[PDB]
Design a binder for this molecule. Structure first.
Ligand SMILES: Cc1nccn1Cc1cccc(C#N)c1
Ligand SMILES: Cc1nccn1Cc1cccc(C#N)c1
Lengths: 264, 265
């Protein structure tokens, strides 16, 4: 991987692995989401991050994902090479955004795109906060100054408000719990695990006859390593679904989302 | 990746990813096991397979893992490049063996080694069988003729018999179940998922203070996509050793047994 000529974005190529594909012999959306996190980490390393900047480390502040939105036109097949370009942008005091474009390396055709919203949190109190001027200034030298959007369209799917699923859910998968492979280097549940848990309550008949085109996921609260989650899904329709992940015991919301599926 | 000069082994380099590492910022043993499966698949593809031979497909036969044995001296760090070499060998009519050697790409130093035993099974009946002469001849042109062992030692750990853990277990993790990410392209549970499930019943205090040096796992029966598993562990021992058992949560049918050896950091 490498930063592009202007140093304001980063590109990396990945060869899709045998264990990374589903029944169609193409990459799962969780494999895609892991590759998006990997190219994002490689971009942060390339621009000098140990993605906390020096001012954030002094104030014990970290970036946390508020929303992930991914749209796939074609999933890369096993053995195929996918090229992913990523970049960041400041969204004033709200937080930051990281965008991605996925391309077929042979044809140069765009096969997918993604966007994510990040908010600042104090790592100890877990209290959310606005982005300060010092953090905005030290971040802005690594971002394009003019807007560059993976989802430019006004009122597009990536910005839509997601409602809360009402009981009873049409489908459910209960008792989901993370294992050590679901944790990151800081012993926190990996953001991609929540995508897998949301998808657990989609009936296999949909998975067997449809391809996932769009997924939007809001992250409200973290699942701890010792927590247990229930995954709930209701059809709202192409097939569209509304999703909710909540703690198995008291029903505290951890995520809400929507998925759009196209018949194969 | 590529076959070596003589065409009897295959090498591939991997850059360790951010999500592939644990608390020490080095690759987990499950990341290592996935890389071993990946280089094995790339080797089979390079020599013309798709690893069922022509005679195997005619008779509806497949290879299934009977045992996996991995020894790691140093886990590669995040961003490091690891080179893995793999090869296969026929073990007469018993089955086949696939071996691997892991090296640090910069220093050329061996950082790990692994071996696995495979047996033939009829895909439909699930009945095990001996390897026929036609199958043995068809895959012998892709294997070294002289023995080449990742574990040459006289009575090495990779061949030891594993006993059955007796109840009560010292530690347990109950109600483990696969999700879609644990399945392969044929909707079967990936062999690496069972390694993760075995390790779930090792106490976190051991994981925090020790490094896993050796794991040997016997595969007795498959966990189906709708099954639920219990992971059981008992200490058998500066080094800590454990005995492991995975069984179905309901009736207690054995699916795997194994042992792990850990060295204090
Ligand atoms: C055995 C197990 N499966 C899920 C959680 N855990 C336990 C645990 C506790 C604290 C930190 C970690 C890490 N890393 C893990
Ligand atoms: C929702 C879920 N989590 C684990 C199993 N499953 C259901 C299932 C059934 C049959 C085939 C497959 C595949 N592939 C999956």
């Amino acid at each position: 991987g490498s930063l592009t000529e202007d140093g304001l974005s980063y590109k990396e190529k990945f060869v899709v692995r045998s264990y990374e594909v589903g029944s169609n012999k193409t990459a799962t959306v969780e494999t895609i989401a892991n590759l998006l996190q990997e190219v994002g980490c490689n971009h942060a390393q390339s621009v000098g991050f140990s993605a906390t900047t020096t001012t954030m480390r002094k104030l014990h502040l970290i970036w946390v994902t508020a929303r992930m939105h991914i749209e796939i036109y074609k999933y890369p097949a096993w053995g195929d090479v996918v090229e992913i370009e990523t970049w960041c942008q400041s969204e004033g005091r709200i937080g930051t955004r990281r965008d991605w474009i996925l391309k077929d390396s042979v044809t140069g055709e765009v096969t997918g795109r993604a966007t994510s919203k990040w908010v600042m949190m104090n790592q100890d109190t877990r209290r959310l906060q606005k982005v300060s001027d010092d953090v905005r200034d030290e971040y802005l030298v690594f971002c394009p100054q003019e807007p560059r959007l993976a989802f430019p369209e006004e009122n597009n799917r990536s910005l839509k408000k997601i409602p809360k699923l009402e009981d009873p859910a049409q489908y459910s998968m209960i008792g989901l719990k993370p294992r050590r492979a679901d944790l990151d280097m800081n012993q926190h549940v990996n953001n991609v695990t929540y995508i897998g848990w949301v998808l657990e309550s989609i009936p296999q008949e949909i998975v067997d006859t449809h391809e996932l085109q769009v997924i939007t996921l809001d992250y409200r609260r973290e699942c701890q390593q010792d927590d247990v989650v229930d995954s709930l899904t209701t059809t709202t329709s192409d097939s569209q679904f509304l999703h909710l992940l909540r703690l198995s015991g008291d029903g505290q919301e951890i995520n809400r989302g929507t998925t759009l599926w196209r018949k194969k």
